[PDB]
Amino acid sequence: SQIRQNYSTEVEAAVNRLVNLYLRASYTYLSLGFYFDRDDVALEGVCHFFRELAEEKREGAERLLKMQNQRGGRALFQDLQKPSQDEWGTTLDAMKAAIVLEKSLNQALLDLHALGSAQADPHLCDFLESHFLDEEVKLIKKMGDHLTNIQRLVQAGLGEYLFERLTL
Amino acid sequence: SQIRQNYSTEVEAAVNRLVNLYLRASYTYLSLGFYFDRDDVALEGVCHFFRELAEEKREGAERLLKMQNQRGGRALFQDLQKPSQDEWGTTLDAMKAAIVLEKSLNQALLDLHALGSAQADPHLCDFLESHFLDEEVKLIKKMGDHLTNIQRLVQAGLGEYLFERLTL
Amino acid sequence: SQIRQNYSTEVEAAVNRLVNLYLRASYTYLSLGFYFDRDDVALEGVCHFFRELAEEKREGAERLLKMQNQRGGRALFQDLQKPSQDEWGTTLDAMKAAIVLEKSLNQALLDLHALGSAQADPHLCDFLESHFLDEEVKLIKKMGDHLTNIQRLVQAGLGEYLFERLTL
Amino acid sequence: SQIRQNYSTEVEAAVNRLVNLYLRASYTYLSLGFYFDRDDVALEGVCHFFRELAEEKREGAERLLKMQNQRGGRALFQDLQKPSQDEWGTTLDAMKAAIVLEKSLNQALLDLHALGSAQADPHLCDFLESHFLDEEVKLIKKMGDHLTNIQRLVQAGLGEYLFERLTL
Ligand SMILES: CC(C)c1cccc(C(C)C)c1O
Ligand SMILES: CC(C)c1cccc(C(C)C)c1O
C-alpha cells in the first residue's frame, strides 16, 4: 500500500480477527434480544438492553474496519459462528453470559494493545485506548452492577419482573 | 344493487356474521371493563385495558359495515348475545378469556379470507389483510406477553397490584 | 405457543432460513462497502451505496425476526457464511454481483410467498407483500438502471470516476 | 526552569527539530499553492488544497512551540530551507510530492514518540497521540485516495480538469 507506514502484518491480522469477534458479539446480542421478545419470555426492557448492545458491537466492528483501511491494511472476513445458545434462560443467566462475552472482548483488546506496544505502533495504541478500552470498562461495570441487583432480587419471578420494570 | 360486482352472497352473509362477532366482542369487553371498576375489584389499569378494547372492536364492526355498503351488500343485524360470564375473576382469568375471544375472532377472519380466495374476491382479501389480520396478530402477541408477566407474578395479591401499576 | 395460530412449521423454518439469507446479504454488502473504501480503490459514492444496503438488509432480517415472534414461531440462528469474494473488482463487477444477490433474495421471498399461499397463511402473504416484495422490485430496477449507465460509460477509468461523482 | 519536570534535553532538542520540519512543510505547501495559481497552470481547487495544508502545518508548529514552553523547554529556531522544487508539474506530480512530505513528517512523529517512550515521558506521548498521529494518518489516507483517483483519470488534460472540478 502507498500509504502503509509502521503497520505490521501481525497487527493487520489481529485487527481482522477482532472484527470477527465484534461481529460475533453483535450476533450473540441479536439472539439474546429476540429471545426476550418471545411471548413466553416477554421482558421488553431486557430485549431492549441486548438489542442496543448488538448495535454498539456492530458499530465497533465498523470502526475497526475503517481504521484498517486508514492504515493501509486489507479487511478479510471469515464465517461468523452462530451464538453459543439458542435459548438464554433467565435474565440472570443472560447477564452472566453477557459479562463472559464482554470480558473476552476486553481481553482481545488488551492482547492487541500489547501487540501494538511490542511493534512500537502508537497510533494503534491510541486508537484502542480512545475508542474501545474505556467503553469496555464502563460496560463491564454496568453489567456487574446489574448482576448484583438481579441476584439481590431472586420469589424469583417477582424479582425478574421488578428488575425489568424499575432498572431497565 | 347497481354497484354490486364480484361480491358473492356467501361473502355478504359471512360479513354480516362477522359484524355480529365483533359487536359481541365489544360487549364482552364492556363487561370486563366495568367488572374491574367494581369497588371490590378496583384495578383501574385493567378496567382501562378492556374499555379500550371494547372501543376497538366496535370500530372494527363499523369498518365492516361500511365495506358491506361499499360493495353493494345489505347489512342484517341479529340479537347480540350477552357475555359468557357476569363476574370475571382475577386479572389472569380475564386475560385468558380475552385471548380465547381474540383467537376466535382471528379464526373467523381467516375463514372469511379463505372464502374470499375461493370466490376470487381480491378486494375482500385485501380489505381483511389491510385492516384486521395484522391488528389481530399484534393484539394476540400483546395479550400473550401480558399473560406471561401475570403468571410470573403469582403472593398473588401483590403480583396482581404490581402488574396493574407497572405494566397497565 | 399460547398465541400460535395458523402458522405452520414449514413457514417457521423457511422464515429462519430467510433471516440467514438477509444477514448473509448484509455481510456481503459490508464487504463490498469497505472494499470501495480502500486507498487503492477510493470510490466514496460506491462505498456509501453498499454500506446503505448493508443497513437495509440487516433491518429486513430484524423485521422478519420480529414477525417470527409475533406469530409464535421460534428464531433459530445458523453460522453466517463469509461473502463469496474478498476483492470485488470494478464498480461494474460489484453492481453485477449485487443484482445477482438481490435476485436470489427476491426468489427466496417469492418461494416463501408460494409456501404461505399453499399453507393458506394470509398474514404471511400480506407481510411479505407489504414489507419486502415491492422493496426488492424497486431496488432491482435501480441496480439495473445503474448497470446500464456504468456500461455506457466504459476510457474505463474516466467512466468509473464520472459515475461515482455524478450518479452516486 | 522552575517548572521543568521529567522533560529530557533529548526530547527538547527533538521538539525543536520537529518545529523546523513543520515550518518547512508549511513553506513547501505555500509554494505548491501559488504554483497552481499561475495563469499557465490555473487549477484553483488544487491551489486551495495546498494553501489549506500550509495553514495546518503552521498551526502544528505553533502547537509544538506552545508545548515546548508548557514543559519548560526553550524554543530554538533554525534557518528554514526553501522547498525542493520551484515548479511542481502536474496535479499527479504534486500529490506524489505531498505524500512523500507527509510520510516524512509522520516518521519524525513516530521517532519522537519512541524517544518519549524510551525517556518515560508520558505527557509527550499523549500530546503526540492526541494532536498529531491521528491527523497524519487521516491526511495520508486522503492523499492516497486522491492519488488513486488522479491515476484513474490519466486524455490527461481532461482528467486533470475533471479532478479539480469534481473532487477538489
Ligand atoms: C448488528 C447485528 C444485528 C448483526 C448480527 C450479525 C451480523 C451482522 C452483520 C455482519 C450482517 C449484524 O449487523
Ligand atoms: C354494547 C356495544 C357493543 C354496542 C352494541 C350495539 C351498538 C353499539 C353502537 C354504539 C355502535 C354498541 O356500542
Curated annotation (Swiss-Prot), chains A, B, C, D:
The keyword Glycosyltransferase does not apply. Keywords: Acetylation, Cytoplasm, Cytoplasmic vesicle, Iron, Iron storage, Lysosome, Metal-binding. It is found in: Cytoplasmic vesicle, Autophagosome; Cytoplasm; Autolysosome. Belongs to the ferritin family. One of its GO terms (molecular function) is iron ion binding. Stores iron in a soluble, non-toxic, readily available form. Important for iron homeostasis. Iron is taken up in the ferrous form and deposited as ferric hydroxides after oxidation. Also plays a role in delivery of iron to cells. Mediates iron uptake in capsule cells of the developing kidney. Delivery to lysosomes by the cargo receptor NCOA4 for autophagic degradation and release or iron. This is Ferritin light chain. Residues 52-59 are annotated as: Catalytic site for iron oxidation. It comes from Equus caballus (Horse).
